[model samples]
Target: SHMRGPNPTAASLEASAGPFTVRSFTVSRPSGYGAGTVYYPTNAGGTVGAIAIVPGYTARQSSIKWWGPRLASHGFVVITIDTNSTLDQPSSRSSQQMAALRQVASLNGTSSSPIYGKVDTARMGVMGWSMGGGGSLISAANNPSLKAAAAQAPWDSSTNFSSVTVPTLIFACENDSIAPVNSSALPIYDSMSRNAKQFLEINGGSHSCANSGNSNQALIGKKGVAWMKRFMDNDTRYSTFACENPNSTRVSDFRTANCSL
Candidate 1:
């Protein structure tokens, strides 16, 4: 499978850190985005995939920064970004997310850069919180080449994402007031019928349930990494972890389609 990690266990995936030693470099000259911090594995055995994450409306990278070291420690070049404007809508966030990925690809080939040759530009993924979550869906819809998309408490004005074909996972806040699961996240999840998708609702969570400083990192982190590794890397070693639902006491509701063991 060309997988680049140790054997997986429910406990291993739930741990805050993974096997690799994580290091980070700030993007000195961010392109199309405002700012970025690139977190990467010092040695992943081989090149690894890249992932770009964005924060919600009226938010900064502070809201999404935790994903950097967490994902990098598991074998991904992760960029957590701040949008050009705190008020940037979902579409603009989508553009900035891809731009962040483009910049990561550039840094990968730049001999003077810290991430030089560390990224597989062909394998990429997107993630975000709130409105930024909506942008992740938009990115996957516009760029089918993307390997995966995971959104946290996503809020989009439109619920028509019937064109998204990328593997997607939605982290829904069961009791969210800002973007209620019934109106925002669930309809968005139901929109895509032609792709691999999963919906995981966090019990007693709020709009920020899966945000950077959220309390449920163990379960959420496990699923986020598992989804990207399962689909983005096309690494079937993660197939069981990605496809099987823990149905833990933490989860309020869950559903999936097109993912197989």
Candidate 2:
């Protein structure tokens, strides 16, 4: 007879990390963005914290698969949507992604939609990579729905991040040329209010590596978990790694201390 641990069944794999139910499905919007999938944990009869995970500019819904599963493992309802890039209109795309999340939450007001009362709208979070990062900043600053924002290899935009007042995290790489480490993300880094901004510079890292699609960029995935946990979860002790104590040396290559330096 095998001894029974906390969760002896097969369903306990991701649950061991935390207690949360997981679900994934597609949602359509009237804004002409078509349909996109949203993955999240459904429990407590609805009404939990929700995080909208947007992918990079060229990335599709599948591009975000790496991070969404991890977020679900940590007791979060993560919605990763496929952006309609044909528009090239960043603002509309972000709005569509955000709207998709809300639609699924309410199941378009259907009894089958897992979104009953399980969403804590006040504690919402938004994050993404590359252009999505730029969108995250725009949504957090301009849109009033999101409470927190996290960007990875963000597109270097001046006006986008200038007005961001929410807690924001920027994960950058030293080798990025498109949004060069300095020119691309630095402007956003400098403009953020004191203690309101945080950055993770991965030495020898680049824009392509932030996606976790390659073996070399794998470390970024692990560290990203830490960032989301601290900031998104509002875990004071872990989040301290950002604002209170930005110099934690958990990862040798990742630095969270100061942005200007």
Candidate 3:
């Protein structure tokens, strides 16, 4: 069910979000989860993958709202949701992430829905920031079917994620105070022994470095979209963006394994 109409390259993926105009609508009673906003490409030509993204502790969907349009414009159906509780832990957020995916899947089959048949349900991804990033890891580990995941400044109490089978991308903020990269992101990235993974640490970014208003989004956003497209769509064209070294001043550290796909 993968959408393969457009061939993606580093330039196309990194270019300003494009190829299709984005359309958004609200999902107020999404099956098992709370409300959310769905963004999708207006003319992707075929069913595309869906991504579920959440926010960190005490954060609302606004924290990561920019991603919906950013990714949707690049041929993905993106959903940004508000958790049932703002203080939900990674495990709870993981549940909500999957719940949002289920809702998207349901919409795919519903004739009246705008996203009807728009989602390649089997090729879904997960992502988030901080505590939500931690939840993204939990979601990947718990659901082996997940195509890919990108955790921005992920925060989790556990570091042994050796069971996770989904490919993962970790965006670490070098100067993070809330969830220090050395303690949270690095440890988790190091423990994913059985998955294809990559880690990108911003030179001096804060805890919210990968969010909407960050200055490094140009570099970070490119990698984020490439990772999802490569793994979720099984498109190897993004290999350079996902596996190659990003010798940039803004990126302090870069690492990857089995990224050729």
Candidate 4:
């Protein structure tokens, strides 16, 4: 199925690889998000799945520049959202995200949810950076609509671990002190159901490596974009690896590992 959008715009993350095209306009609850932006592939040669991106604490829609256009370049639709601007509550933000998912999916003309129909909701994925990752875990594990989750150094808020059932990709930086890779990523990876999983230990990266910008951290961010493409779009090479290929180690260093799948 070929999904259509309003027009093609240049994303901040657009690079030599390709441009991320955005379309359609909508208002989500808890308005005042300025205006919500929904991004999709410029050309959906076949039925493609959609991904909802949730930013971390203090992050805005523009922060998704890395994955939005990067994934779109590979034929997957990426939706970047601003869940909440405060630390009001991480689990509460999860509820807001699924509610917005409901609104987005309703565009498909279904009472239950148009998201699954308009896009291959069965192949849906949720990606969150920092606290946003916590929300993704909640949705993938709790929300019935989500099929998988990609969390970047997830910040745990003491949520139950036995609930998460979808495939998960987590990236951790050995040098990160904000969320401590050892305490956060390792435990989460070990505790979550091992039905599907992947983890990367970035050597020289920091918390800012996931955002879009002209800084050096963006190089790592670009690599992050590539990882999202492989897993979310089911790119054969990365998907195969993500599907338990066992070669989980990609970029290895004396101090850390930088993975691409």
lDDT by residue (196-230, candidate 4, tens digit) is 56676665557655556623343344444444545
Tell me the spans in candidate 2 whose CA falls farther than 4 Å from its real position: 1-21, 28-32, 43-46, 156-160, 214-233, 241-261
Estimate TM-scores for all models: 0.98, 0.75, 0.96, 0.71
Better of 1 and 2 by lDDT: 1
lDDT of 4 at 200: 62
Q: In candidate 1, which residue pairs clash?
A: none
What lDDT is obtained when candidate 3 is compared to the true structure?
Answer: 0.87
Q: Which candidate, 1 or 3, has the higher lDDT?
A: 1
Candidate 2, run of 10 with poorest lDDT: 1-10
Candidate 2 vs candidate 3: the TM-score winner is 3
**Per-residue alpha-carbon lDDT of candidate 1 for residues 111-185, written as tens digits (9 for 90 to 100):** 999889989899999999999999999999999999999999999889889999999999999999999999999
| Candidate 2, 1-261: lDDT as tens digits | 111112212223323243555676666453334456656665433345667766776577666666676666554567777766633445655676577556555653466665555555556777777777777777787765465677877873463366676767777777887778768776677777633566767666667655646433334444444445555555443443334333433322333433222
lDDT of each: 0.92, 0.59, 0.87, 0.57
List clashing residue pairs in candidate 4. 105-114, 105-115
The alpha-carbon root-mean-square deviation between model 2 and the true structure, to one decimal in Å, is 6.6
How far residue 166's Cα lies from its native spot in candidate 4, in Å, is: 0.8
What's the CA error at residue 131 for candidate 4, in Å? 0.9
Q: Model 1 compared with the native: what TM-score?
A: 0.98
**Rank order (by lDDT, best first):** 1, 3, 2, 4
Residues 1-261 of candidate 3 have per-residue lDDT tens digits of: 354646666567667675788889999577655678999887887778999999999898888998888788878999998999888998999999999999999988989888888888888999999989989999998999999999999998888889998999999999999999889989999998898999999999899998888897678878888888788987777776778788789989988887774
Question: Candidate 1, which ten residues in sequence have the lowest lDDT sum?
Answer: 1-10
